[PDB]
Amino acid sequence: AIKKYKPITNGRRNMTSLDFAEITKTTPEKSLLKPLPKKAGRNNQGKLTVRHHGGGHKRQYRVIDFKRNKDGINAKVDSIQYDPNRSANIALVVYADGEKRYIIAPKGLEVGQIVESGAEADIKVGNALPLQNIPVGTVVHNIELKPGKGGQIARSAGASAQVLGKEGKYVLIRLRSGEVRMILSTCRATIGQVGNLQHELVNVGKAGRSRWKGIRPTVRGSVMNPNDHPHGGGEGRAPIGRPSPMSPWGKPTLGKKTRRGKKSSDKLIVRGR
Amino acid sequence: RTYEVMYIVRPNIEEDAKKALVERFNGILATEGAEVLEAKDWGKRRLAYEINDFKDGFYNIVRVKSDNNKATDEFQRLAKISDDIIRYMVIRE
Amino acid sequence: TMTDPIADMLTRVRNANMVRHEKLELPASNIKKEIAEILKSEGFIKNVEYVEDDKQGVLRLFLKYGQNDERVITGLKRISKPGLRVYAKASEMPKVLNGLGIALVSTSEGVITDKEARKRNVGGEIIAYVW
Amino acid sequence: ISQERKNEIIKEYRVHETDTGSPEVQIAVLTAEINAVNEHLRTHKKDHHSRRGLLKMVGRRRHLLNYLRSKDIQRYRELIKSLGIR
Amino acid sequence: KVCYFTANGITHIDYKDTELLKRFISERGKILPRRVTGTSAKYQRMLTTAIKRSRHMALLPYV
RNA sequence: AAACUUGAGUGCAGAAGAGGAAAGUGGAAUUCCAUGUGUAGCGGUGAAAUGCGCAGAGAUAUGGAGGAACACCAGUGGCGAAGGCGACUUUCUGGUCUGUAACUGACGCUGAUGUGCGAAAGCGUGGGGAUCAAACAGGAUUAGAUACCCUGGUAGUCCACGCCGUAAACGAUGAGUGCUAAGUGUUAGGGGGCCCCUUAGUGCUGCAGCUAACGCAUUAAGCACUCCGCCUGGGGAGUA
RNA sequence: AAGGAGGUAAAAAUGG
Ligand SMILES: [Mg+2]
Ligand SMILES: [Mg+2]
Ligand SMILES: [Mg+2]
Ligand SMILES: [Mg+2]
Ligand SMILES: [Mg+2]
Ligand SMILES: [Mg+2]
Ligand SMILES: [Mg+2]
Ligand SMILES: [Mg+2]
Ligand SMILES: [Mg+2]
Ligand SMILES: [Mg+2]
């Protein structure tokens, strides 16, 4: 899974990478591609509103079926492919009527395997079902919050959640974060865990590789000036020098909770992370 | 290689639903080149302890002979998935 | 495994003599039979019988006890061994117990006693001491 | 290996009919057993206890091969080329 | 003394023979010791395995 | 150079086993969470206190979460080279013992160097985390108490994959082989009439012999042969 | 009846 580079240079020293053995086709499905120009963290006013985004390799977008709403028709896993837009890999599947779609690639999905969706689908990896029909204790991913909107939860590499119980209109689920919350039982989920489990272990190794990923450098608050940052100024190095560490925009940033009050989901959230 | 498979169906099962369930699982145990030598029912019996809050259970016995255990494994997988079968066990001989 | 049949035979004789047994059965071989014949001729044992059965045959020794139940064989000692073999010249032939004992020897003229080795003026491999 | 496969191997390699103790028969059966245990270990890597018996079989086959090579070089060469154990 | 199985000649014990297993099970459900039941060790092993099978299949109780 | 079947393996018919590896199922119990009842203690000790609890603890009933170990069987019992192996089920797999006498015909023993396994603690990466618990905090005891005791409590204790390679890793008893009184149990077998004989283990008692003595004594520490390892006063030192 | 092996409770201030 993980390949460790030899220290031929100080740049490569301690660097690692995925071996991409899971990938079975190295080019994408042409008809499922769309252009994805970079925003570099700049909004519709043309202003930088999120720091540290910019540059990086050009990417095409792969249209991904998060909805899994094509029910009662088998689809055969043509290939597992790399996708630059997300940590998970993606499986190109071919339905029995000849329509082709990308899905998040679950752990253990193999080329030639069959997947299905709907209330009658079997409980096996890659099948999509309403939480109504998914048994208690099952590990799932790509979970909807609103029926028919498409999966929004547990889509990263290695992500999964566990079905815990079934109230009347809602099913209890334990999310990767540890939160236990209710989700409408008409919402769908895909059986299994998202694949590419070694993603998090990669040692990026050098600054340039982050740059290829489109991440620009993070300048620490303490090495700016007072007009730049609450931590700026001071002669020589200085400690934080106030009761709490502060964000660049002057808000406390260590332990201060920011979840807004009076949210609709607060009565659905059973146990915080 | 022979196998005796014993399973328990929940007491609160309709007659037709139980008939369909037993037929389905007998067919499963027959599928993978495994010949069902003989299937029988011991009726509803009192359980020595509550299983899923049930004091009774419909006991089904099946004998099947096979050269592998694919049918038995599929039976066990579908019995774990099922919410109608409470207990199951497979004995070689 | 077995590595010295002659030592095994001598130890069988010693153990039987200690327990004051009358007879002793062991697997046979030509060297063992010659040793037993020398013992009989010298008077340390009573009789020797050979059983020409299958599996190399059997030797059946009969031990000799004097008056007062005194043991005629006082002791047997293996001299030459697989781990270290001992040879002596005719003029260097050892006397066991100042002559009161025998040294069984193996010579070009057959396995004989030290007295015969000295008489014939020959040496050889000193198989054992008996007294 | 199954007794049926063992019977097949001994029939194939026996020097004469009714021969079960020949070095050829013993070492062919040992080759089959060694291969079966190797295939088992490939899946069950951490089965040291099984691997120990495997090594005992390997050493027994080695000693049988040494004896056969000492007694009849041509038979030894023929057997090793037949079994692919060199 | 004598062993029930050795005397009766039965050379196999079926875990579904709850009436027979009740003979060697205690009042509270524990397996009676061999030195008390008189059974042989060979069949005591078979009995223990059968009793545990029955416990798993809920034919017999644990406690 | 040529033969033999007694050692060593093989075939044939049988036996038991917590031997190992991987998946799955299960009951008891502990901790925690929620809720109903309920009042002022609980817990703990030699005696206490810290601590928890009037915001409702502890007790009790129900449900849920999760980790870990398998009560009775269980036995000088079994298995394994040793370390070790105890819920149940399935798959893969190692070894051992019994009888037989087709089969090979000495092919055996030991084993420096080598190569593997190896309790617990410990190390790395990633998981997991109930219980217990180094460190640590508080209370007690005490002349003092860096403890024993009490209340907590992190690593760790569990899993995967690597590493480490050590223990009073002991029977403080190297392996192989044969021989040398007996009595009596038990595990797995076999043969001849509850009895006798017999194979392999596992215990106890006890001759000859051995031993400084204690003791060992067919499971030798007796009598012998082969090979290996090791010792040569106590410290210094398993150190430089 | 007297000796050998395994497990297993309950008790406990401190200094001579
Ligand atoms: Mg940033
Ligand atoms: Mg500056
Ligand atoms: Mg400022
Ligand atoms: Mg400052
Ligand atoms: Mg300064
Ligand atoms: Mg450890
Ligand atoms: Mg403590
Ligand atoms: Mg040491
Ligand atoms: Mg030692
Ligand atoms: Mg014995």
From Swiss-Prot, chain A:
Disulfide bonds: none annotated. GO terms for biological process: cytoplasmic translation. One of its GO terms (cellular component) is large ribosomal subunit. SMART domains: Ribosomal_L2, Ribosomal_L2_C. SUPFAM superfamilies: Nucleic acid-binding proteins, Translation proteins SH3-like domain. InterPro entries: NA-bd_OB-fold, Rib_uL2_dom2, Ribosomal_uL2, Ribosomal_uL2_bac/org-type, Ribosomal_uL2_C, Ribosomal_uL2_CS, Ribosomal_uL2_dom3, Ribosomal_uL2_RNA-bd_dom. Residues 35-54, 212-273 are annotated as: Disordered. One of the primary rRNA binding proteins. Required for association of the 30S and 50S subunits to form the 70S ribosome, for tRNA binding and peptide bond formation. It has been suggested to have peptidyltransferase activity; this is somewhat controversial. Makes several contacts with the 16S rRNA in the 70S ribosome. Part of the 50S ribosomal subunit. Forms a bridge to the 30S subunit in the 70S ribosome. Belongs to the universal ribosomal protein uL2 family. This is Large ribosomal subunit protein uL2. It comes from Staphylococcus aureus (strain NCTC 8325 / PS 47). The lineage of its organism: Bacteria, Bacillati, Bacillota, Bacilli, Bacillales.
From Swiss-Prot, chain B:
The keyword rRNA-binding applies. One of its GO terms (cellular component) is ribonucleoprotein complex. It comes from the Bacteria. It holds the Pfam family Ribosomal_S6. InterPro entries: Ribosomal_bS6, Ribosomal_bS6_CS, Ribosomal_bS6_sf, Ribosomal_S6_plastid/chlpt, Transl_elong_EF1B/ribsomal_bS6. Belongs to the bacterial ribosomal protein bS6 family. PANTHER family: MITOCHONDRIAL 28S RIBOSOMAL PROTEIN S6, SMALL RIBOSOMAL SUBUNIT PROTEIN BS6M. This is Small ribosomal subunit protein bS6. The lineage of its organism: Bacteria, Bacillati, Bacillota, Bacilli, Bacillales. The gene is rpsF.
Curated annotation (Swiss-Prot), chain C:
The keyword Iron does not apply. Pfam families: Ribosomal_S8 (PF00410). Keywords: Ribonucleoprotein, Ribosomal protein, RNA-binding, rRNA-binding. Coiled coil: none annotated. The keyword Signal does not apply. SUPFAM superfamilies: Ribosomal protein S8. One of its GO terms (molecular function) is structural constituent of ribosome. It comes from the Bacteria. One of its GO terms (biological process) is translation. PANTHER family: 40S RIBOSOMAL PROTEIN S15A (PTHR11758). This is Small ribosomal subunit protein uS8. It comes from Staphylococcus aureus (strain NCTC 8325 / PS 47).
Swiss-Prot record, chain E:
Belongs to the bacterial ribosomal protein bS18 family. The chain holds residues 14 to 76 of 80 of the full protein. This is Small ribosomal subunit protein bS18. Keywords: Ribonucleoprotein, Ribosomal protein, RNA-binding, rRNA-binding. One of its GO terms (molecular function) is small ribosomal subunit rRNA binding. Signal peptide: none annotated. One of its GO terms (biological process) is translation. It comes from Staphylococcus aureus (strain NCTC 8325 / PS 47). One of its GO terms (cellular component) is cytosolic small ribosomal subunit. Part of the 30S ribosomal subunit. Forms a tight heterodimer with protein bS6. Binds as a heterodimer with protein bS6 to the central domain of the 16S rRNA, where it helps stabilize the platform of the 30S subunit.
